[PDB]
Amino acid sequence: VSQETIKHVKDLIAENEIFVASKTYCPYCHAALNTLFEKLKVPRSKVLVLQLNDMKEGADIQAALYEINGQRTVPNIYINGKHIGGNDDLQELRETGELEELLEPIL
Numbered sequence: 001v002s003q004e005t006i007k008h009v010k011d012l013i014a015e016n017e018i019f020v021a022s023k024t025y026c027p028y029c030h031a032a033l034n035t036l037f038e039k040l041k042v043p044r045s046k047v048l049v050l051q052l053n054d055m056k057e058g059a060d061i062q063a064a065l066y067e068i069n070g071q072r073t074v075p076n077i078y079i080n081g082k083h084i085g086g087n088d089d090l091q092e093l094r095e096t097g098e099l100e101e102l103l104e105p106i107l
């Protein structure tokens with residue numbers, strides 16, 4: 001995986017208040033996106049959702065995200081440039097009452 005690809009993924013993570021790498025058929029991605037837009041009412045203009053399976057760079061992006069954060073699955077969620085993880089990770093922050101503070105500066 002190229003150095004330039006890593007930098008491109010870093011850039012997209014920093015230029016967007018929430019970053020989700022997803023796949024259109026992944027039910028975990030549907031759960032996470034549903035939580036974000038529908039339950040937590042996060043404006044869509046604040047979220048970059050990349051459906052990697054619908055994109056040329058799909059595979060390079062996922063591999064780049066492994067190099068960056070060690071995660072290999074989707075959804076791969078960043079909030080305010082901070083690495084969240086998958087849907088389990090997102091749902092867990094809700095259950096510990098800790099997600100609310102990460103969303104403040106954003107929402």
Ligand SMILES: *SC[C@H](NC(=O)CC[C@H](N)C(=O)O)C(=O)NCC(=O)O
Nearest residue numbers: 026027028072073074075086087088
């Ligand atoms: S649905 C596609 C797969 N995703 C998951 O397994 C997510 C489970 C996590 N525990 C979560 O986010 O809650 C997946 O990414 N499979 C491998 C792949 O390369 O697509």
